[PDB]
A paper describes a structure:
Triosephosphate isomerase (TIM) is a ubiquitous enzyme that catalyzes the interconversion between glyceraldehyde 3-phosphate and dihydroxyacetone phosphate. TIM belongs to the family of α-β barrels proteins, in which 8 central β strands are surrounded by 8 α helices; the strands and helices are joined by loops. A peculiarity of TIM is that only in its dimeric form the enzyme exhibits high catalytic rates, albeit each monomer has its own catalytic residues. DTDA is a powerful inhibitor of the activity of TIM from T. cruzi.
On the other hand we were able to obtain crystals of the complex by soaking crystals of TcTIM with 1 mM DTDA. The RMS deviation of the Cα traces of native TcTIM and the DTDA treated enzymes was 0.39 Å. The data also showed that in the position of Cys118, which is far from the interface, the two monomers exhibited electron densities that fitted well with a structure in which the sulfur of Cys118 was covalently linked through a disulfide bond to a thioaniline moiety.Thus, in TcTIM crystals, DTDA was able to derivatize Cys118; however, as shown by the data on the Cys118Val mutant, the inhibition of activity by the compound does not depend on the perturbation of Cys118. Accordingly, and in regard to the inhibition of activity of TcTIM by DTDA, it is relevant that the enzyme soaked with DTDA exhibited significant and rather unique alterations in its dimer interface. The change in conformation of loop3 of monomer A was accompanied by alterations in the contacts that it establishes with residues of monomer B. In native TcTIM, the side chain of Cys15 of the two subunits is well defined, and their N and O atoms are respectively, hydrogen bonded to the O and N atoms of Gly73 of the adjacent subunit. In the DTDA treated enzyme, these H-bonds are missing. This was consequence of an increase in the distance between Gly73 of monomer A and Cys15 of the other subunit; in the treated enzyme, the distances between N and O atoms of Gly73 and the O and N atoms of Cys15 were 7.9 and 9.2 Å, respectively. Therefore, it is likely that in the crystal, an intermediate of the overall conformational changes induced by DTDA was trapped.
Residue numbers in the entry:
A (entry chain B), B (entry chain A): 2 to 251
Write the structure that this text describes.
Protein backbone atom coordinates (compact mmCIF):
# COMPACT_ATOMS: atom_id res chain seq x y z
CA UNK A 1 0.00 0.00 0.00
CA UNK A 2 1.01 3.71 -0.31
CA UNK A 3 4.00 4.79 1.99
CA UNK A 4 3.45 5.91 5.56
CA UNK A 5 5.16 8.95 7.06
CA UNK A 6 8.90 8.74 6.49
CA UNK A 7 11.55 8.94 9.24
CA UNK A 8 14.97 10.53 8.97
CA UNK A 9 16.96 9.39 12.08
CA UNK A 10 20.43 10.58 13.06
CA UNK A 11 22.63 8.31 15.13
CA UNK A 12 25.17 10.71 16.50
CA UNK A 13 27.02 7.59 17.86
CA UNK A 14 29.38 8.84 20.52
CA UNK A 15 30.94 11.79 18.76
CA UNK A 16 29.94 15.46 18.96
CA UNK A 17 31.01 17.89 21.68
CA UNK A 18 29.35 21.22 22.44
CA UNK A 19 31.87 22.70 19.85
CA UNK A 20 30.62 20.33 17.06
CA UNK A 21 26.90 19.93 18.00
CA UNK A 22 25.89 23.57 18.49
CA UNK A 23 26.57 24.63 14.82
CA UNK A 24 25.02 21.33 13.70
CA UNK A 25 21.86 21.94 15.82
CA UNK A 26 21.71 25.55 14.35
CA UNK A 27 21.83 24.18 10.77
CA UNK A 28 18.94 21.77 11.36
CA UNK A 29 17.03 24.52 13.19
CA UNK A 30 17.49 26.88 10.17
CA UNK A 31 16.24 24.24 7.79
CA UNK A 32 12.60 24.02 6.77
CA UNK A 33 10.97 20.79 5.56
CA UNK A 34 7.67 21.29 3.79
CA UNK A 35 6.73 17.68 3.78
CA UNK A 36 5.40 15.23 6.32
CA UNK A 37 8.59 13.66 7.84
CA UNK A 38 9.54 12.62 11.38
CA UNK A 39 13.06 13.57 12.01
CA UNK A 40 14.87 11.95 14.99
CA UNK A 41 18.20 12.82 16.54
CA UNK A 42 19.97 10.40 18.95
CA UNK A 43 22.70 12.28 20.83
CA UNK A 44 24.95 10.53 23.42
CA UNK A 45 23.33 10.55 26.85
CA UNK A 46 25.62 13.44 27.95
CA UNK A 47 24.59 15.62 25.00
CA UNK A 48 20.87 15.06 25.30
CA UNK A 49 20.38 18.05 27.75
CA UNK A 50 21.98 20.66 25.40
CA UNK A 51 20.19 19.07 22.48
CA UNK A 52 16.78 19.36 24.16
CA UNK A 53 17.50 23.00 25.30
CA UNK A 54 18.68 24.04 21.81
CA UNK A 55 16.86 21.98 19.19
CA UNK A 56 13.80 23.78 17.67
CA UNK A 57 13.09 22.30 14.17
CA UNK A 58 9.43 21.28 14.55
CA UNK A 59 9.83 17.97 12.63
CA UNK A 60 12.35 16.74 15.24
CA UNK A 61 12.30 14.42 18.22
CA UNK A 62 15.22 13.53 20.41
CA UNK A 63 16.03 9.82 20.89
CA UNK A 64 18.28 7.85 23.22
CA UNK A 65 20.81 5.55 21.54
CA UNK A 66 20.16 2.83 24.08
CA UNK A 67 18.61 2.23 27.50
CA UNK A 68 18.12 -0.45 30.25
CA UNK A 69 14.64 -1.65 31.34
CA UNK A 70 14.72 -0.65 35.02
CA UNK A 71 16.44 1.98 37.23
CA UNK A 72 18.44 0.87 40.28
CA UNK A 73 21.75 -0.93 40.80
CA UNK A 74 23.32 -0.66 37.24
CA UNK A 75 26.41 1.58 37.31
CA UNK A 76 27.08 3.42 33.99
CA UNK A 77 23.62 2.74 32.52
CA UNK A 78 20.56 4.96 31.78
CA UNK A 79 17.07 3.49 32.27
CA UNK A 80 13.87 3.99 30.26
CA UNK A 81 12.26 5.70 33.27
CA UNK A 82 15.07 8.24 33.79
CA UNK A 83 14.92 9.07 30.04
CA UNK A 84 11.11 9.40 30.19
CA UNK A 85 11.26 11.73 33.29
CA UNK A 86 13.59 13.95 31.29
CA UNK A 87 10.99 14.18 28.51
CA UNK A 88 12.71 11.77 26.09
CA UNK A 89 10.09 9.72 24.25
CA UNK A 90 12.18 7.96 21.54
CA UNK A 91 14.92 5.35 21.90
CA UNK A 92 17.04 3.22 19.53
CA UNK A 93 17.22 -0.44 20.58
CA UNK A 94 19.15 -3.46 19.35
CA UNK A 95 21.75 -1.52 17.47
CA UNK A 96 24.34 -3.90 15.85
CA UNK A 97 27.15 -2.35 17.97
CA UNK A 98 25.16 -3.35 21.01
CA UNK A 99 24.43 -6.86 19.82
CA UNK A 100 28.04 -7.46 18.76
CA UNK A 101 30.19 -5.64 21.34
CA UNK A 102 27.87 -5.32 24.24
CA UNK A 103 26.27 -8.77 24.52
CA UNK A 104 22.72 -7.74 23.56
CA UNK A 105 20.98 -10.98 22.57
CA UNK A 106 17.68 -11.28 20.69
CA UNK A 107 15.95 -11.79 24.08
CA UNK A 108 17.73 -8.83 25.66
CA UNK A 109 16.74 -6.58 22.73
CA UNK A 110 13.14 -7.88 22.71
CA UNK A 111 12.74 -7.34 26.47
CA UNK A 112 13.99 -3.70 26.17
CA UNK A 113 11.54 -3.00 23.38
CA UNK A 114 8.59 -4.50 25.31
CA UNK A 115 9.43 -2.27 28.31
CA UNK A 116 10.13 0.91 26.28
CA UNK A 117 6.85 0.29 24.55
CA UNK A 118 4.95 -0.06 27.88
CA UNK A 119 6.80 3.06 29.10
CA UNK A 120 5.19 4.98 26.20
CA UNK A 121 8.33 5.26 23.99
CA UNK A 122 8.42 5.11 20.16
CA UNK A 123 11.08 2.56 19.42
CA UNK A 124 13.58 2.15 16.57
CA UNK A 125 14.31 -1.56 16.73
CA UNK A 126 17.52 -2.44 14.88
CA UNK A 127 17.99 -5.67 12.91
CA UNK A 128 20.73 -6.99 10.59
CA UNK A 129 22.89 -9.90 9.53
CA UNK A 130 26.71 -10.07 9.58
CA UNK A 131 28.94 -10.90 6.58
CA UNK A 132 29.46 -14.43 7.95
CA UNK A 133 25.65 -14.85 8.30
CA UNK A 134 24.95 -13.39 4.77
CA UNK A 135 27.54 -15.70 3.13
CA UNK A 136 26.01 -18.73 4.91
CA UNK A 137 22.81 -17.70 3.07
CA UNK A 138 21.13 -17.00 6.42
CA UNK A 139 20.07 -13.36 5.91
CA UNK A 140 16.35 -14.10 6.14
CA UNK A 141 16.69 -16.59 9.10
CA UNK A 142 18.74 -14.09 11.13
CA UNK A 143 16.78 -10.85 10.55
CA UNK A 144 13.44 -12.63 10.85
CA UNK A 145 14.54 -14.33 14.13
CA UNK A 146 15.62 -10.98 15.52
CA UNK A 147 12.33 -9.54 14.39
CA UNK A 148 10.08 -12.45 15.59
CA UNK A 149 11.90 -12.38 18.96
CA UNK A 150 10.70 -8.82 19.41
CA UNK A 151 7.21 -9.38 17.94
CA UNK A 152 6.68 -12.35 20.40
CA UNK A 153 6.81 -9.83 23.34
CA UNK A 154 4.35 -7.39 21.81
CA UNK A 155 0.72 -7.27 20.76
CA UNK A 156 -0.99 -5.84 17.68
CA UNK A 157 -1.41 -2.46 19.33
CA UNK A 158 2.32 -2.03 20.11
CA UNK A 159 3.20 -1.57 16.43
CA UNK A 160 1.91 2.07 16.11
CA UNK A 161 4.97 2.77 18.36
CA UNK A 162 7.52 0.49 16.63
CA UNK A 163 9.85 1.36 13.75
CA UNK A 164 12.29 -1.15 12.25
CA UNK A 165 15.84 -0.15 11.10
CA UNK A 166 17.66 -2.51 8.78
CA UNK A 167 21.44 -2.47 9.36
CA UNK A 168 23.37 -4.19 6.66
CA UNK A 169 26.08 -5.26 9.16
CA UNK A 170 27.68 -7.43 6.42
CA UNK A 171 28.30 -4.21 4.43
CA UNK A 172 29.18 -2.03 7.48
CA UNK A 173 31.82 -4.49 8.71
CA UNK A 174 33.34 -5.06 5.25
CA UNK A 175 33.50 -1.29 4.42
CA UNK A 176 30.93 -1.65 1.60
CA UNK A 177 28.11 0.55 0.48
CA UNK A 178 25.03 -1.65 -0.05
CA UNK A 179 23.06 -0.85 -3.24
CA UNK A 180 19.43 0.39 -3.25
CA UNK A 181 18.67 -3.20 -4.47
CA UNK A 182 20.48 -4.94 -1.61
CA UNK A 183 18.67 -2.69 0.88
CA UNK A 184 15.29 -3.20 -0.73
CA UNK A 185 15.77 -6.96 -0.93
CA UNK A 186 15.81 -7.21 2.88
CA UNK A 187 13.14 -4.51 3.48
CA UNK A 188 10.80 -6.41 1.25
CA UNK A 189 11.22 -9.68 3.25
CA UNK A 190 10.83 -8.00 6.58
CA UNK A 191 7.58 -6.42 5.34
CA UNK A 192 6.32 -9.75 3.89
CA UNK A 193 6.85 -11.37 7.30
CA UNK A 194 5.06 -8.49 9.05
CA UNK A 195 2.15 -8.65 6.57
CA UNK A 196 1.63 -12.38 7.15
CA UNK A 197 2.07 -12.44 10.99
CA UNK A 198 0.47 -9.10 12.07
CA UNK A 199 -1.75 -7.87 9.23
CA UNK A 200 -1.85 -5.72 6.15
CA UNK A 201 -2.86 -2.72 8.29
CA UNK A 202 0.25 -3.15 10.54
CA UNK A 203 2.45 -3.94 7.44
CA UNK A 204 1.21 -0.80 5.51
CA UNK A 205 1.77 1.63 8.44
CA UNK A 206 5.16 0.30 9.56
CA UNK A 207 8.22 2.31 8.88
CA UNK A 208 11.28 0.31 7.94
CA UNK A 209 14.35 2.54 7.85
CA UNK A 210 17.56 1.73 6.12
CA UNK A 211 20.60 1.82 8.52
CA UNK A 212 23.43 1.28 6.03
CA UNK A 213 25.68 3.92 4.50
CA UNK A 214 23.54 6.96 3.70
CA UNK A 215 24.78 10.17 2.04
CA UNK A 216 23.16 13.11 0.26
CA UNK A 217 24.40 11.33 -2.86
CA UNK A 218 22.50 8.06 -2.31
CA UNK A 219 19.61 9.16 -0.01
CA UNK A 220 17.05 9.74 -2.78
CA UNK A 221 17.71 6.54 -4.72
CA UNK A 222 17.42 4.57 -1.43
CA UNK A 223 14.09 6.30 -0.59
CA UNK A 224 12.61 5.45 -3.97
CA UNK A 225 12.76 1.73 -3.10
CA UNK A 226 9.30 0.35 -2.44
CA UNK A 227 9.85 -0.75 1.20
CA UNK A 228 12.24 1.93 2.41
CA UNK A 229 10.58 4.45 4.66
CA UNK A 230 13.68 6.37 5.53
CA UNK A 231 17.03 6.13 7.25
CA UNK A 232 19.11 5.66 10.31
CA UNK A 233 22.14 7.66 9.29
CA UNK A 234 25.68 7.33 10.72
CA UNK A 235 28.47 9.81 9.83
CA UNK A 236 26.59 12.10 7.44
CA UNK A 237 24.02 12.94 10.23
CA UNK A 238 26.74 14.85 12.01
CA UNK A 239 27.10 17.09 8.92
CA UNK A 240 25.09 19.86 7.20
CA UNK A 241 24.19 17.40 4.37
CA UNK A 242 21.82 15.63 6.82
CA UNK A 243 19.45 18.40 5.74
CA UNK A 244 19.60 17.03 2.14
CA UNK A 245 19.18 13.49 3.50
CA UNK A 246 15.95 14.63 5.20
CA UNK A 247 14.84 16.38 1.95
CA UNK A 248 15.27 13.07 0.04
CA UNK A 249 12.31 11.47 1.88
CA UNK A 250 9.96 13.95 0.17
CA UNK B 1 52.22 5.74 57.46
CA UNK B 2 49.79 8.63 58.13
CA UNK B 3 46.73 8.60 55.81
CA UNK B 4 46.53 10.68 52.57
CA UNK B 5 43.53 12.89 51.79
CA UNK B 6 40.24 10.95 52.17
CA UNK B 7 37.57 10.68 49.47
CA UNK B 8 33.83 10.38 49.81
CA UNK B 9 32.43 9.28 46.44
CA UNK B 10 28.74 8.99 45.68
CA UNK B 11 27.63 6.46 43.06
CA UNK B 12 24.10 7.40 41.92
CA UNK B 13 23.99 4.21 39.73
CA UNK B 14 21.00 3.93 37.44
CA UNK B 15 18.84 6.35 39.54
CA UNK B 16 17.41 9.79 39.25
CA UNK B 17 15.01 12.42 38.27
CA UNK B 18 15.59 16.09 38.09
CA UNK B 19 12.79 16.16 40.68
CA UNK B 20 15.09 14.36 43.18
CA UNK B 21 18.57 15.71 42.41
CA UNK B 22 17.85 19.47 42.61
CA UNK B 23 17.18 19.50 46.48
CA UNK B 24 20.01 16.98 47.03
CA UNK B 25 22.51 19.20 45.21
CA UNK B 26 21.21 22.25 47.20
CA UNK B 27 22.02 20.39 50.45
CA UNK B 28 25.48 19.40 49.20
CA UNK B 29 26.09 23.07 48.25
CA UNK B 30 25.27 24.24 51.79
CA UNK B 31 27.33 21.45 53.47
CA UNK B 32 30.50 22.76 55.00
CA UNK B 33 33.36 20.56 56.40
CA UNK B 34 36.17 21.14 58.95
CA UNK B 35 38.73 18.74 57.32
CA UNK B 36 40.49 18.10 53.94
CA UNK B 37 38.26 15.65 52.00
CA UNK B 38 37.80 15.12 48.25
CA UNK B 39 34.16 14.61 47.61
CA UNK B 40 33.03 13.11 44.29
CA UNK B 41 29.52 12.73 42.90
CA UNK B 42 28.91 10.35 40.00
CA UNK B 43 25.48 11.08 38.35
CA UNK B 44 24.11 9.26 35.25
CA UNK B 45 25.47 10.68 31.94
CA UNK B 46 21.99 12.17 31.42
CA UNK B 47 22.21 13.96 34.80
CA UNK B 48 25.84 15.10 34.55
CA UNK B 49 24.96 18.44 32.76
CA UNK B 50 22.35 19.41 35.50
CA UNK B 51 24.89 18.54 38.23
CA UNK B 52 27.70 20.46 36.55
CA UNK B 53 25.31 23.44 36.25
CA UNK B 54 24.07 23.34 39.86
CA UNK B 55 26.93 22.01 42.13
CA UNK B 56 29.12 24.71 43.59
CA UNK B 57 30.51 23.10 46.75
CA UNK B 58 34.27 23.40 46.13
CA UNK B 59 35.22 20.17 48.00
CA UNK B 60 33.30 18.25 45.31
CA UNK B 61 34.19 16.84 41.86
CA UNK B 62 31.95 15.23 39.25
CA UNK B 63 32.66 11.71 38.02
CA UNK B 64 31.12 9.53 35.26
CA UNK B 65 29.98 6.05 36.31
CA UNK B 66 31.72 4.60 33.23
CA UNK B 67 33.29 5.54 29.88
CA UNK B 68 34.72 3.95 26.75
CA UNK B 69 38.17 4.49 25.11
CA UNK B 70 38.60 5.56 21.43
CA UNK B 71 38.51 1.88 20.40
CA UNK B 72 35.11 0.74 21.71
CA UNK B 73 31.78 0.60 19.92
CA UNK B 74 30.29 4.09 20.49
CA UNK B 75 26.50 3.46 20.11
CA UNK B 76 24.88 3.86 23.50
CA UNK B 77 28.31 4.62 25.04
CA UNK B 78 30.04 7.84 26.22
CA UNK B 79 33.74 8.30 25.63
CA UNK B 80 36.58 9.57 27.82
CA UNK B 81 37.22 12.34 25.26
CA UNK B 82 33.59 13.45 25.21
CA UNK B 83 33.59 13.63 29.03
CA UNK B 84 36.84 15.59 29.14
CA UNK B 85 35.45 18.02 26.61
CA UNK B 86 32.47 18.48 28.93
CA UNK B 87 35.06 19.36 31.63
CA UNK B 88 34.62 16.10 33.64
CA UNK B 89 37.92 14.80 35.05
CA UNK B 90 36.87 11.96 37.41
CA UNK B 91 35.72 8.51 36.32
CA UNK B 92 34.64 5.30 38.11
CA UNK B 93 35.95 2.22 36.27
CA UNK B 94 35.63 -1.51 36.66
CA UNK B 95 32.54 -1.39 38.79
CA UNK B 96 31.35 -4.83 39.93
CA UNK B 97 28.03 -4.42 38.13
CA UNK B 98 29.88 -3.79 34.87
CA UNK B 99 32.37 -6.67 35.40
CA UNK B 100 29.30 -8.90 36.16
CA UNK B 101 26.47 -7.78 33.81
CA UNK B 102 28.25 -6.01 30.99
CA UNK B 103 31.27 -8.32 30.46
CA UNK B 104 34.16 -6.04 31.36
CA UNK B 105 37.17 -8.26 31.87
CA UNK B 106 40.31 -7.43 33.72
CA UNK B 107 41.95 -6.37 30.41
CA UNK B 108 39.11 -4.14 29.35
CA UNK B 109 38.97 -2.32 32.69
CA UNK B 110 42.80 -1.90 32.45
CA UNK B 111 42.55 -0.35 28.96
CA UNK B 112 39.87 2.08 30.11
CA UNK B 113 42.00 2.89 33.18
CA UNK B 114 45.21 3.50 31.23
CA UNK B 115 43.35 5.57 28.67
CA UNK B 116 41.54 7.64 31.34
CA UNK B 117 44.82 8.30 33.08
CA UNK B 118 46.51 9.43 29.77
CA UNK B 119 43.61 11.87 29.29
CA UNK B 120 44.04 13.55 32.73
CA UNK B 121 41.43 11.72 34.75
CA UNK B 122 41.47 10.69 38.38
CA UNK B 123 40.34 7.20 38.25
CA UNK B 124 38.35 5.24 40.86
CA UNK B 125 39.33 1.68 39.96
CA UNK B 126 36.92 -0.88 41.46
CA UNK B 127 37.88 -4.45 42.57
CA UNK B 128 36.18 -7.10 44.74
CA UNK B 129 35.43 -10.77 45.03
CA UNK B 130 32.07 -12.52 44.82
CA UNK B 131 30.58 -14.69 47.55
CA UNK B 132 31.64 -17.89 45.68
CA UNK B 133 35.19 -16.59 45.24
CA UNK B 134 35.37 -15.73 48.92
CA UNK B 135 34.06 -19.15 49.91
CA UNK B 136 36.69 -20.94 47.82
CA UNK B 137 39.53 -19.03 49.54
CA UNK B 138 40.11 -16.89 46.41
CA UNK B 139 39.73 -13.25 47.72
CA UNK B 140 43.46 -12.23 47.39
CA UNK B 141 43.87 -14.06 44.09
CA UNK B 142 40.85 -12.34 42.59
CA UNK B 143 41.43 -8.81 43.86
CA UNK B 144 45.23 -8.89 43.20
CA UNK B 145 44.61 -10.14 39.66
CA UNK B 146 42.05 -7.40 39.01
CA UNK B 147 44.50 -4.90 40.40
CA UNK B 148 47.61 -6.39 38.70
CA UNK B 149 45.91 -6.25 35.27
CA UNK B 150 45.38 -2.52 35.77
CA UNK B 151 48.87 -1.96 37.26
CA UNK B 152 50.68 -3.37 34.27
CA UNK B 153 49.21 -0.87 31.75
CA UNK B 154 50.43 1.92 34.00
CA UNK B 155 53.73 3.48 35.09
CA UNK B 156 54.92 4.86 38.47
CA UNK B 157 53.69 8.42 37.68
CA UNK B 158 50.17 7.23 36.89
CA UNK B 159 49.57 6.33 40.60
CA UNK B 160 48.92 9.89 41.67
CA UNK B 161 45.71 9.78 39.55
CA UNK B 162 44.60 6.28 40.73
CA UNK B 163 42.19 5.40 43.52
CA UNK B 164 41.21 1.79 44.36
CA UNK B 165 37.67 1.10 45.65
CA UNK B 166 37.29 -2.26 47.26
CA UNK B 167 33.73 -3.45 46.97
CA UNK B 168 33.02 -6.96 48.06
CA UNK B 169 30.17 -7.98 45.68
CA UNK B 170 28.39 -9.69 48.61
CA UNK B 171 28.22 -6.18 50.32
CA UNK B 172 26.65 -4.37 47.35
CA UNK B 173 22.93 -3.66 47.93
CA UNK B 174 22.57 -6.42 50.58
CA UNK B 175 22.67 -4.60 53.93
CA UNK B 176 25.68 -6.84 54.65
CA UNK B 177 28.67 -4.63 55.27
CA UNK B 178 32.21 -6.00 55.68
CA UNK B 179 33.02 -5.76 59.35
CA UNK B 180 35.73 -3.10 59.75
CA UNK B 181 38.20 -5.99 60.05
CA UNK B 182 37.03 -7.84 56.91
CA UNK B 183 37.59 -4.63 54.94
CA UNK B 184 40.83 -3.66 56.68
CA UNK B 185 42.25 -7.09 55.89
CA UNK B 186 41.59 -6.61 52.18
CA UNK B 187 42.68 -2.90 52.03
CA UNK B 188 45.91 -4.15 53.63
CA UNK B 189 46.43 -6.91 51.10
CA UNK B 190 45.95 -4.35 48.25
CA UNK B 191 48.24 -1.66 49.73
CA UNK B 192 50.91 -4.24 50.51
CA UNK B 193 50.93 -5.48 46.87
CA UNK B 194 51.03 -1.87 45.71
CA UNK B 195 54.10 -1.45 47.99
CA UNK B 196 55.90 -4.55 46.59
CA UNK B 197 55.62 -3.19 43.01
CA UNK B 198 55.76 0.54 43.56
CA UNK B 199 57.51 1.15 46.89
CA UNK B 200 56.92 3.01 50.15
CA UNK B 201 55.83 6.44 48.78
CA UNK B 202 53.24 5.27 46.26
CA UNK B 203 51.68 2.76 48.70
CA UNK B 204 51.38 5.34 51.47
CA UNK B 205 49.90 7.99 49.17
CA UNK B 206 47.30 5.76 47.40
CA UNK B 207 43.65 6.02 48.50
CA UNK B 208 41.84 2.74 48.93
CA UNK B 209 38.18 3.28 49.51
CA UNK B 210 35.65 0.93 50.91
CA UNK B 211 32.38 0.27 49.09
CA UNK B 212 29.43 -1.88 50.15
CA UNK B 213 26.52 -0.89 52.41
CA UNK B 214 28.17 2.28 53.79
CA UNK B 215 25.73 4.30 55.96
CA UNK B 216 26.08 7.16 58.44
CA UNK B 217 25.72 4.40 61.12
CA UNK B 218 28.84 2.36 60.01
CA UNK B 219 31.12 4.81 58.21
CA UNK B 220 32.99 6.18 61.22
CA UNK B 221 33.89 2.66 62.51
CA UNK B 222 35.18 1.80 59.01
CA UNK B 223 37.13 5.01 58.53
CA UNK B 224 38.99 4.23 61.83
CA UNK B 225 40.75 1.28 60.13
CA UNK B 226 44.34 2.02 59.16
CA UNK B 227 44.07 1.07 55.38
CA UNK B 228 40.68 2.65 54.71
CA UNK B 229 40.76 6.08 53.13
CA UNK B 230 37.09 6.79 52.64
CA UNK B 231 34.13 5.43 50.76
CA UNK B 232 32.29 4.65 47.57
CA UNK B 233 28.69 5.01 48.64
CA UNK B 234 25.67 3.72 46.74
CA UNK B 235 22.08 3.92 48.13
CA UNK B 236 23.02 6.30 50.96
CA UNK B 237 24.65 8.73 48.49
CA UNK B 238 21.22 9.81 47.30
CA UNK B 239 20.05 10.89 50.79
CA UNK B 240 21.04 13.81 53.12
CA UNK B 241 22.89 10.98 54.97
CA UNK B 242 25.79 11.35 52.58
CA UNK B 243 26.94 14.55 54.29
CA UNK B 244 27.20 12.61 57.59
CA UNK B 245 29.32 9.97 55.76
CA UNK B 246 31.67 12.65 54.45
CA UNK B 247 32.01 14.01 58.00
CA UNK B 248 32.91 10.48 59.11
CA UNK B 249 36.17 10.76 57.08
CA UNK B 250 37.42 13.38 59.63
Amino acid sequence: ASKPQPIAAANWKCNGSESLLVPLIETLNAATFDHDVQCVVAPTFLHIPMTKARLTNPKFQIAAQNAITRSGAFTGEVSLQILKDYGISWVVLGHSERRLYYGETNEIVAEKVAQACAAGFHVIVCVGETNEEREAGRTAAVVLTQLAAVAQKLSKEAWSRVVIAYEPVWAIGTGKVATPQQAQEVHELLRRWVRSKLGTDIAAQLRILYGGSVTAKNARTLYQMRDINGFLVGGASLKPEFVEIIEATK
